[PDB]
Design a protein around this ligand. Structure first.
Ligand code: MNR
Ligand SMILES: Oc1ccc(Br)cc1
Length: 137
């Protein structure tokens, strides 16, 4: 289920993080408006860029911590507020996060592994709701 998935993702996190974020960028190309330095690059070229690998894994490091601290796929209010207040997120809206989690859920469903895709869909929706409650437009 959800908790086992966190362990599975953590056991190969740099690869999962990059592959999921690439799925997001490729499914939603306009989202590169927030990633100007990732424009004009193929998947393999992005994977060679130091900040791409390091930032994506750090993003997913924390996403797993937020998932791990959640109850029934509902994140803590303190984690949601952290995500709203981060300066790195100053320009973002809940739709940016919804699209990330649509891509994450589709990635899991296209994989051959028994990911609990339904719980990750709940987690993404519940995260969006917590982000809105904590002030994100
Ligand atoms: C589509 C937009 C974005 C979505 C969705 C998103 C969703 C999430 C998310 C999901 C639950 C988590 C956990 C998360 C966490 C982070 N995030 Mn976030 N994020 N996020 C950015 C846009 C987005 N984030 C940007 C832009 C930056 C800073 C620039 C960069 O590192 O390229 C950043 C930065 C970061 C960093 C700092 C990385 C460092 O400096 O190396 C963490 C940690
Ligand atoms: O550098 C970044 C990579 C992926 C996300 Br999601 C946010 C920032």
């Amino acid at each position: 289920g959800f908790k086992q998935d966190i362990a599975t993702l953590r056991g190969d996190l740099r690869t999962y993080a990059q592959d999921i974020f690439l799925a997001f960028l490729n499914k939603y190309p306009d989202e590169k408006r927030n990633f100007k330095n990732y424009v004009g690059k193929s998947d393999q070229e992005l994977k060679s860029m130091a900040k791409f690998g390091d930032h994506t894994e750090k993003v997913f490091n924390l996403m797993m911590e937020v998932a791990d601290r959640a109850t029934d796929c509902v994140p803590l209010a303190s984690d949601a507020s952290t995500l709203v207040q981060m300066k790195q997120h100053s320009g973002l809206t809940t739709g940016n996060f919804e699209k990330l989690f649509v891509a994450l859920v589709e990635y899991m469903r296209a994989s051959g592994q028994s990911f609990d895709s339904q719980s990750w869909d709940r987690f993404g929706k519940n995260l969006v709701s917590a982000l809105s409650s904590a002030g994100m437009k």
